[PDB]
Amino acid sequence: MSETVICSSRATVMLYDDGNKRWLPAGTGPQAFSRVQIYHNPTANSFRVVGRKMQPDQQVVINCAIVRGVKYNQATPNFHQWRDARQVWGLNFGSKEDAAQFAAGMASALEALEG
C-alpha cells in the first residue's frame, strides 16, 4: 500500500486566502465533505495529509506535507486549521468523532516530527 496512513476523518477541507482574508474550497468548487487521511512516512521522517471527496467523482481536496512545522489550531470542535508555509488548510468536519479522529493521527505526526 502507498505509505502508511495515520488516521481518517470526515470533513470538507478548506483553503484560506490571506490575500482576501477568508476561506476557499481546497479542491475544486463543489463541496460535500471529504475523507482526509494522514500519511506516516518514517522513511524520511515526514508527514503529509491526503483527502478526497465522498462522491463517484473522487477528487483529492487536500494533498500537502507536514514536517515539524505545522501545529493544529482547531478553530472549533469541528474544524482544523493549520498554517504551514503561507497558506492555511482549514477543513470543516461534520461529526465530533471526525474532528476528534483527525487530530488523533495528525497530533501523532507533529509529535513524531517535532520530537
UniProtKB/Swiss-Prot annotation:
Keyword Cytoplasm among UniProt keywords: yes
Modified sites of kind Phosphotyrosine: 39
Chief place of localization: cytoplasm
Protein name: Vasodilator-stimulated phosphoprotein
Function: Ena/VASP proteins are actin-associated proteins involved in a range of processes dependent on cytoskeleton remodeling and cell polarity such as axon guidance, lamellipodial and filopodial dynamics, platelet activation and cell migration. VASP promotes actin filament elongation. It protects the barbed end of growing actin filaments against capping and increases the rate of actin polymerization in the presence of capping protein. VASP stimulates actin filament elongation by promoting the transfer of profilin-bound actin monomers onto the barbed end of growing actin filaments.
Origin species: Homo sapiens (Human)
Signal peptide positions (record): none
GO biological process, one term: axon guidance
